[PDB]
Design a protein around this nucleic acid. Structure first.
Ligand SMILES: O=P(O)(O)O[C@H]1[C@H](OP(=O)(O)O)[C@@H](OP(=O)(O)O)[C@H](OP(=O)(O)O)[C@@H](OP(=O)(O)O)[C@H]1OP(=O)(O)O
Ligand SMILES: [Mg+2]
Lengths: 357, 159, 108, 366, 378
RNA sequence: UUGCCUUUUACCAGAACCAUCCGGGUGUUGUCUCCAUAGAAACAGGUAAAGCUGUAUUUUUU
RNA sequence: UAAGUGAUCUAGAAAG
């Protein structure tokens, strides 16, 4: 997250950012609500290079920089137990199938058939979809009788907004189905004022569904590539232990040389100065790499929506406290939370059914 | 880098140094806490030192020094020991040391809270429930000397 | 300086400017694990502790019926039912048979 | 340089005077404890608000397998894979490896000194036998003082690297060349010891001439260039005789020279063995401070002295790995280099200083 | 020294300790802060002791007695104000000193030397600290009294014991006291020079020290000492001439320089023998097993070698040995025989020793001689 | 700009500027040295040695 | 699921 060191030199940065975007294709450059600009690098070194280019040769401005955050993504673990509607629309949700996730990351009848090939899903759910990014299923009972359910293009766009800015901390939604269950469209209404209602209302519905779906936050994971001399193998393992959530999957021995080009997986959060640290520890015998093309997201350990949750302010938060910390902290970053003390929670009536009764 | 051999000795030395001063210091307490936290061996050392104190060394001290010691132990007790307490007969200065300790605890934790905490623990010598023929009278009596409750309750229970 | 933590530089200070890590740092590194029993006790102390459900049930029920309808659609569209009447008729049948069964359910 | 520019000293290496005089705890998530090592690795990214920061290298993994002895072309350190009448090229060359190619390969992998089989000469001075030790990392668990020495050395090195002093080219009339041009100099092949002794004699005569010229005959130069007054001095006389930082500096340089030349004389005069000489010279260079108050007059020589000390600390503990303690190490090269460079630095300064001095002796002061 | 960038935001637990006032050969000097009762302790303590006092006052009333300081002993030094303030020599005068704190405060505005302890008054509150503890602990911590004096020129004075010490002029004394430490052999760059007429190698100039030493050896005192010792030795030889078969005990008259000249040495006494002597191989005085090789001498020599040691060069035996086989085996200032004897006296430590060749049955005489001279040379 | 300090030299070590100096490269001239020291050989071939090419049955030529 | 690797400034002469 960039901010120019002086607000006097802000326009320059914007121009600079534009230039960077033009020149560096693999950079999502979201201008966040505060003014604090987000830059999404591919990884570390690339990001650094980008910044160097910006800070030296285009901006020529001193720049405040956040420590390397990671684009998280909200999701669910189970199907949404409730179906609470939205008003001045009740959208249920559930976890997309893990094969189907992968299938998605890369003619209705045809699509239906494909769906039944992927996860053996029902033809009812197959017909009513309109997915993006995850899946918008138009699966109430009245929707086939009704043509209020028709003209769901606006509705789909609203859904797109939901996907973009999730309930938790404006973190994009990932791996989640969306079963519609009702709509609160009265008889006489203009399509402008009704559609306009439904757009934010759609977002609200989605958020509600997520809340009721036991929402979980998903961090990404770098696929790792570490060539090291065989003698320095257990060191790498130790380092991984030192890192959080890091898995080591196959130590394929590269023939005809001491290199054990070991694949791995470090969570994108835990990964920072990984290359460098490895190099240091390995005495420069461990030319390591990180990358993210699989789009292999995963649940941050620990459960969102906890009061006490964690211990530390300075120290890295525990495993079971982590998700909550990430959420609240990211909300603060994104300026959603009010001051220091706050909480991510449901904006609905009935006292949340007295907190699940 | 002191080995497991003298850790106990080190702790003893520390205690003695504490005693030498005019009053109990936060300093020593913090030091004790840190060391305790560090390694299980030091926890053991501190424990065994405590045992040594209430066993044999305790009765040699003067009411000022003794009081200080009690305070120190109380501070430690409030956090980094379990309230294990090997405690009618032995009331020369040990019992008054105990008084000081209890005072410290109450001041730190709180009365009801303290009671709750001890309730959770065993507390054989402090709070016997099995009557033992006018023996609870003694403990009860001693705790009436300081502001403590539940002694009355205990006696009621016992008849 | 070193890790955001050394002295700016040894000139000025009027000393070595040697920078030990404390060994109380291990205590500050693991006080939650060391004093887990402090929170554990507390946690233990408070460790014992319809409309939506109904809605869900309803959805499941209507949804089931709609699955029947879908199935009808499948059978028709695949195996010899090019006409619309076949589809509509099938739907009607589903409604009648399904809502009959579900009327039975209601009765029970 | 990066470490310098951010005050993010890499603990094995140097630490400098600082180059200069949102982000809240509530916001960020300290998952990786962000180390200084990273703050120089990707300087523009991990270290926010960089200034004057260079970009370092980034690199490939080296598997240069070196052979021990008595063999060639063998997989040792590593594991093996899973699975019309004409001869081929270079036929009748049965032996694949020559007797030198075992070594040639090694040579090929070597660094800049031996890498190559031709070069231009450099001055003994210009060769840095010691730079390669402290530029590469300190071996294993030396005493704190030696570690400090290493750091000091690196600090010097980085400074030298950092302020490039581009030599000006137009002035291609050297001093010696200029002198050669005239008639009043002749040239001879003289033994270095002879040169030394003659130069002590010359220097002594010079300084005495200067002192007597000034008038203050009561300052007796000893032949060992250790100046002292003969009589108790009248205040006026005393005032007169406070010779400045030029003359004294000159004396000190001659003292330095007189020492090493004298040691050579001793060696060659049958007194001491060559090892003893080498040690002697080394002692002199590492204890110039302690043998001639050069620092007194020109205190920036402390840097030179410090450098020498550092070298000694470095050298000895590479010289005394398995060998025990004691004084008998020689190896005077890098210290000698230091002193040469100090002289290089000062030759201008003394040309100015003593220039003005003798001008005053001759022409009145302005 | 915790993480400066984080520490600004929130209080950290102290993580990294910087080295404050460091030193080479780090003897852990205790602070002062440990020997002052921290305020909270002082105040809780005060509350206790004053409560106790109150209770005992009531007891006194009930009993109808004067509550004497014999009963309140222990608490005498505790509390605020200090209990001592109850029984000091004039409370009934100080009873009428109301508005005392304010007056002490406003001494600030009406005086040049504004008192450093404005904030309390000893009459009203008593000694709110006591740093004899600090003194004692500090001396215990620098290796004790015993060890500090090795730094000092105590050994030079030659008292029976240091315990028998008790019963720009003032700082001169101070400088002279730490002469050995301050003028040290092991030293960074200090260039060696010697003071005039002496063997007091100053490792880099110190003015005050120089002034001291020069005053110490005024009237060529070093030279006089040297010559005196030589004379004494000559006398001794004369006395025991016929015992050790000596033809003539002649003094080789050297320049006055010799006394304190250190690069070279002419022999002070030359010893013409009657018969050939068969002197032992060179050795120290206390080295008992003197090896009598077949080598003989018709003539010995005695040299004195005065020295003034430091806290670093405070062994003499080694030095004297060095001197002996330096000047012998050096082609400047040759002795008539390369076989001879050399005495050296550490004037800074009264540590006599001598090295060299030994005529049979001579050593005991020399040992005894040195013992005598050291006990009382004029 | 800091530090030691406190009065300056001398300095601490950073900055920006600049200069000096120890050296270096080539290229061209000239000198100095040590060795030298020929005003004509091919063609016709031969001898020997060095540089390229050569060893029909459908698209080159049978 | 329970310890201790590591960062180490100076530094002396003149004249006052
Ligand atoms: O560190 P320095 O102050 O420069 O002194 C060193 C150091 O002596 P200290 O450690 O006592 O200070 C060396 O000792 P080691 O660290 O190597 O044990 C010693 O080197 P040697 O052991 O090789 O003798 C050397 O002495 P020398 O100069 O005789 O080599 C000596 O230097 P100084 O003698 O100048 O103090
Ligand atoms: Mg003035």
């Amino acid at each position: 997250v960039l901010q120019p060191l002086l607000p006097r030199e802000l326009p320059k940065l914007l121009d600079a950012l534009n230039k960077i975007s033009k020149y560096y294709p693999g950079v999502i450059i979201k201008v966040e609500e505060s003014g604090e600009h987000v830059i999404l690098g591919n990884g570390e070194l690339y990001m650094d290079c980008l910044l160097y280019d910006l800070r030296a040769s285009y901006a020529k401005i001193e720049i405040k920089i956040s420590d390397p955050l990671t684009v998280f993504s909200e999701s669910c673990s189970n199907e949404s137990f409730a179906s609470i509607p939205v008003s001045n629309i009740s959208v249920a949700a559930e976890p997309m199938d893990s094969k189907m996730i992968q299938d998605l990351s890369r003619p209705r009848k045809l699509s239906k058939i494909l769906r039944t090939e992927y996860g053996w899903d029902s033809l009812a759910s197959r017909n009513v979809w309109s997915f993006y990014v995850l899946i918008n299923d138009t699966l109430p009972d009245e929707i086939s009788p009704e043509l209020l359910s028709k003209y769901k293009e606006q509705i789909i766009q609203g859904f797109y907004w939901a996907v973009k800015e999730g309930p938790l901390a404006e973190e994009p939604i990932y791996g989640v189905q969306y079963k519609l269950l009702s709509i609160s469209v009265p008889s006489d209404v203009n399509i402008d004022v009704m559609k306009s209602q439904i757009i934010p209302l759609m977002k609200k519905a989605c958020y509600v569904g997520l809340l009721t779906a036991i929402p979980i936050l998903l961090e990404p994971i770098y696929e790792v590539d570490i060539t090291v001399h065989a003698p320095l193998l257990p060191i790498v393992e130790e380092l991984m232990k030192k890192r959080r959530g890091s898995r080591i999957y196959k130590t394929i021995k590269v023939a005809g040389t001491p290199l054990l080009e070991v694949r791995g997986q470090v969570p994108v959060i835990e990964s920072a100065g990984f290359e460098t640290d490895l190099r240091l520890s390995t005495n420069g015998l461990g030319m390591c790499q990180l990358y993210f093309w699989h789009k292999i997201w995963r649940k941050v350990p620990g459960d969102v929506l906890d009061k006490d949750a964690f211990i530390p302010k300075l120290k890295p938060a525990p495993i079971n406290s982590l998700s909550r910390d990430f959420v609240m902290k990211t909300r603060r970053r994104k300026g959603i939370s009010t001051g220091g003390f706050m909480s991510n929670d449901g904006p609905t009536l009935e006292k949340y059914i007295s907190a699940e009764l | 880098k002191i080995a497991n051999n003298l850790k106990k000795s080190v702790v003893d030395i520390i205690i003695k140094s504490s005693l030498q001063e005019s009053t109990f210091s936060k300093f020593y307490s913090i030091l004790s806490e840190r060391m305790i936290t560090f390694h299980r061996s030091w926890q053991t050392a501190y424990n065994e030192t405590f045992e040594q104190n209430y066993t044999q060394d305790i009765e040699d001290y003067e009411t000022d020094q003794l009081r200080i010691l009690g305070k120190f132990w109380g501070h430690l007790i409030s956090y980094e020991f379990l309230p294990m307490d090997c405690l009618e007969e032995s009331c020369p200065q040990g019992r008054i040391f105990i008084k000081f300790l209890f005072q410290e605890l109450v001041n730190e934790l709180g009365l009801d809270e303290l009671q709750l905490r001890l309730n959770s623990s065993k507390l054989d010598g402090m709070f016997p429930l099995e009557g033992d023929a006018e023996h609870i009278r003694y403990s009860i009596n001693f705790f009436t000397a300081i502001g403590l409750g539940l002694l009355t309750e205990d006696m009621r229970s016992r008849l | 300086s070193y890790n955001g933590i050394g002295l700016k530089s040894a000139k000025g200070s009027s000393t070595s400017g040697h920078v030990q890590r404390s060994l109380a740092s291990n205590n500050r590194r693991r006080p939650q694990g060391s004093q887990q029993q402090r929170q554990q006790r507390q946690n233990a102390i408070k460790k014992a502790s319809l409309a939506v459900q109904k809605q869900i049930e309803t959805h499941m029920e209507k949804r089931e019926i709609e699955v029947q309808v879908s199935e009808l659609r499948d059978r028709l569209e695949e195996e010899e039912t090019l006409s619309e009447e076949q589809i509509d008729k099938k739907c009607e049948a589903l409604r009648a048979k399904l809502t009959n069964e579900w009327q039975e359910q209601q009765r029970m | 340089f990066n470490g310098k520019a951010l005050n993010n000293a890499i603990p094995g290496g140097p630490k400098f005077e600082p180059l200069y005089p949102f982000n809240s705890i509530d916001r960020v998530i300290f998952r990786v404890p962000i180390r200084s090592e990273y703050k120089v690795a990707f300087p523009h990214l991990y270290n926010s608000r960089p200034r004057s920061v260079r970009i370092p290298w980034y690199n490939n993994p080296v598997s240069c397998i070196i052979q021990n002895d008595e063999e060639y072309d063998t997989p040792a350190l590593f594991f093996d894979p899973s699975l019309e009448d004409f001869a081929p090229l270079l036929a009748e060359e049965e032996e694949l490896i020559l007797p030198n190619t075992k070594d040639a390969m090694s040579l090929y992998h070597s660094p800049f000194p031996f890498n190559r089989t031709k070069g231009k000469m450099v001055r003994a001075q210009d060769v840095a036998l010691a730079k390669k030790w402290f530029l590469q990392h300190p071996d294993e668990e030396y005493p704190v003082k030696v570690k400090v020495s290493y750091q000091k050395l690196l600090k010097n090195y980085v400074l030298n690297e950092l302020h490039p002093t581009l030599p000006t080219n137009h002035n291609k009339t050297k001093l010696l060349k200029s002198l050669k041009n005239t008639k009043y100099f002749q040239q001879t092949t003289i033994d270095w010891v002879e040169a030394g002794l003659q130069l002590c004699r010359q220097g002594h005569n010079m300084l005495n001439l200067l002192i007597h010229r000034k008038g203050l005959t009561y300052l007796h130069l000893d032949y060992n260039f250790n100046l002292k007054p003969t009589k108790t001095l009248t205040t006026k006389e005393r005032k007169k005789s406070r010779l400045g930082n030029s003359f004294h500096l000159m004396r000190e340089l001659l003292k330095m020279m007189k020492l090493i030349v004298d040691t050579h004389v001793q060696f060659r005069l049958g007194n001491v063995d060559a090892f003893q000489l080498a040690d002697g010279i080394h002692y002199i260079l590492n204890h110039i401070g302690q043998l001639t108050g050069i620092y007194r007059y020109k205190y920036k020589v402390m840097h030179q002295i410090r450098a020498c000390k550092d070298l000694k600390h470095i050298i000895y503990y590479k010289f005394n790995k398995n060998l025990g303690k004691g004084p008998g190490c020689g190896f005077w090269q890098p210290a000698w280099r230091v002193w040469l460079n100090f002289l290089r630095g000062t030759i201008p300064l003394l040309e100015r200083y003593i220039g003005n001095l003798i001008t005053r002796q001759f022409e009145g002061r302005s | 020294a915790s993480d400066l960038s984080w520490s600004k935001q929130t209080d950290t637990g102290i993580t990294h300790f910087r080295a404050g006032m460091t030193h080479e050969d780090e003897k852990l000097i205790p602070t002062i802060f440990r020997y002052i009762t921290t305020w909270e302790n002082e105040f809780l303590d005060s509350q206790r002791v004053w409560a106790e006092y109150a209770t005992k006052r009531q007891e006194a009333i009930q009993q109808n007695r004067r509550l004497a300081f014999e009963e309140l002993e222990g608490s005498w030094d505790r509390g605020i104000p200090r209990i001592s303030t109850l029984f000091q020599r004039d409370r009934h005068t100080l009873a009428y000193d109301r508005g005392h704190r304010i007056r002490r405060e406003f001494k600030q505005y009406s005086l040049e030397r504004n008192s450093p302890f404005w904030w309390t008054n000893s009459h009203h509150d008593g000694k709110l600290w006591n740093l004899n503890a600090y003194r004692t602990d500090v001396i215990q911590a620098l290796g004790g009294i015993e060890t500090i004096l090795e730094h000092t020129l105590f050994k030079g004075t030659g008292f029976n014991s240091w315990e028998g010490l008790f019963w720009q002029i003032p700082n001169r004394r101070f400088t002279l006291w730490w002469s050995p430490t301050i003028n040290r052999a092991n030293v960074y760059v200090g260039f060696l020079v010697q003071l005039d007429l002496t063997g007091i190698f100053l490792h880099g100039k110190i003015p005050t020290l120089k002034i001291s030493l020069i005053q110490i050896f005024r009237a060529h005192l070093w030279q006089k000492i040297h010559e005196s010792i030589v004379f004494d030795i000559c006398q001794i030889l004369d006395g025991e001439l016929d015992v050790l078969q000596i033809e003539s005990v002649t003094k080789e008259t050297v320049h006055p320089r010799k006394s304190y000249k250190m690069n070279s040495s002419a022999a002070d006494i030359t010893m013409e023998s009657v018969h050939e002597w068969e002197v032992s191989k060179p050795s120290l005085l206390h080295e008992t097993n003197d090896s009598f090789k077949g080598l003989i001498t018709n003539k010995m020599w005695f040299d004195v070698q005065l020295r003034y040691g430091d806290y670093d060069s405070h062994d003499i035996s080694r030095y004297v040995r060095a001197k002996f086989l330096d000047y012998t085996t050096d082609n400047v200032s040759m002795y008539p025989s390369p076989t001879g004897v050399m005495i050296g006296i550490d004037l800074a430590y009264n540590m006599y020793d001598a090295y060299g060749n030994w005529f049979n049955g001579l050593k005991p005489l020399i040992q005894n001689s040195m013992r005598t001279i050291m006990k009382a040379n004029p």
